[PDB]
Design a protein around this ligand. Structure first.
Ligand code: FNR
Length: 344
């Protein structure tokens, strides 16, 4: 049956209710960037080296000083219990099995503590939204610290929610039994009520003082903003267009990655998300200077198939595709994945 990530999406469409599948699938507005996040990867071509000896391929690397089994991590996707009863608990259990990290959404259908308890040995980070209520925001950070999370990914591209047309048509909301467990389109209205449109670099200063945990700015698309993040003492940049769900018509993340890598001058790690579906996508992102990539939608499709097992299957497929791509490219380990491997 399911042998690549595209197969998992197709299966998910057949088993999920339309409103739930559309919530997960959709981009903003006409979905121009959604298509481009995938198409852009295909424009970057590979220039493999032969006869390098790839008998022993080592996929391991590090994210903010913590070892991972591969440069492929789970990105924050809200409300995972819509896809499978076990939701974020299934996800964290799979990450623990694989030896990779899970970024937990602030809008999760499972708590910061429920997830630490299900995956005590897993590498775990918290994705933070800055709520109008700074006390709520502090509590989330403090819980992350107490429960053994290793970094804060602060999302900086969402002063308001993007306009996803299917969610408006469907009047999207949670199924009746579910809740965000740490507290038109229903989600757009929620954001308007809860999330602060005023946040500025001064609020990053506040956050930097609040915690000693590593902080990564998630959603940066400009080199000038990346340099400002470095100036504020942040510890990484996640080059992201929010899975094409915020401003439509921004570039693909693979296309802006080189500008951002250049701008930070090696001072902090740079990551990527948006459109990663294949092992060659991962290879391309590393050749252009990313330390690791995050996957969003593929994880939700794993859940929709078979919960924990379906997430593990998706991560295993990406791991094996990546291993093969490295080997066929002449790369024994991630340290030798260089810029001459790709051209646009
Ligand atoms: C259904 C769904 C739900 C969320 C997201 C995305 C999607 C598709 N994303 C953005 C996410 O972290 C990531 O940037 C993208 O999913 C990456 O793109 P791909 O889905 O892998 O193409 C997201 N980001 C975030 O900071 N907080 C959140 O709660 C969510 N929730």
């Amino acid at each position: 049956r399911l042998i690549c990530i595209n197969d998992y999406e197709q299966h998910a469409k057949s088993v999920l209710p339309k409103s739930i599948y559309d919530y997960y699938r959709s981009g903003a507005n006409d979905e121009e960037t959604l298509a481009d996040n995938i198409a852009a990867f295909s424009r970057w071509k590979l220039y493999p080296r032969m006869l390098r000896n790839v008998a022993e391929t080592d996929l391991s690397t590090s994210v903010l000083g913590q070892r991972v089994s591969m440069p492929i991590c789970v990105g924050a996707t809200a409300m995972q219990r819509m896809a499978h009863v076990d939701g974020e608990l299934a996800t964290v259990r799979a990450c623990q099995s694989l030896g990779t990290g899970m970024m937990l959404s602030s809008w999760a259908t499972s708590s910061i503590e429920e997830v630490a308890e299900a995956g005590p040995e897993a590498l775990r980070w918290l994705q933070l939204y800055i709520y109008k209520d700074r006390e709520v925001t502090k509590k989330l950070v403090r819980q992350a610290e107490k429960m053994g999370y290793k970094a804060i990914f602060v999302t900086v591209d969402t002063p308001y929610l993007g306009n996803r047309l299917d969610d408006v048509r469907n009047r999207f909301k949670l199924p009746p039994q579910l809740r965000m467990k740490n507290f038109d389109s229903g989600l757009a209205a929620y954001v308007a009520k809860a999330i602060d449109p005023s946040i500025s670099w001064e609020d990053i200063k506040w956050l930097r003082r609040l915690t000693s945990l590593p902080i990564v700015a998630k959603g940066i698309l400009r080199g000038d903003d990346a340099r400002e993040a470095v100036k504020h003492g942040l510890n990484g940049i996640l080059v992201s267009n929010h899975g094409a769900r915020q401003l439509d018509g921004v570039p693909a993340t693979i296309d802006v990655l080189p500008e951002i890598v250049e701008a930070v001058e090696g001072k902090v790690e740079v990551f990527l998300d948006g459109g990663v579906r294949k092992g060659t996508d991962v290879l391309k992102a590393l050749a252009l200077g990313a330390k690791a990539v995050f996957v969003g939608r593929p994880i939700v499709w794993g859940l929709a198939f078979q919960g924990e097992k379906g997430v593990q299957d998706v991560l295993e497929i990406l791991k094996e595709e990546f291993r093969l791509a490295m080997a066929l490219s002449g790369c024994q380990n991630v340290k030798v994945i260089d810029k001459t491997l790709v051209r646009k």
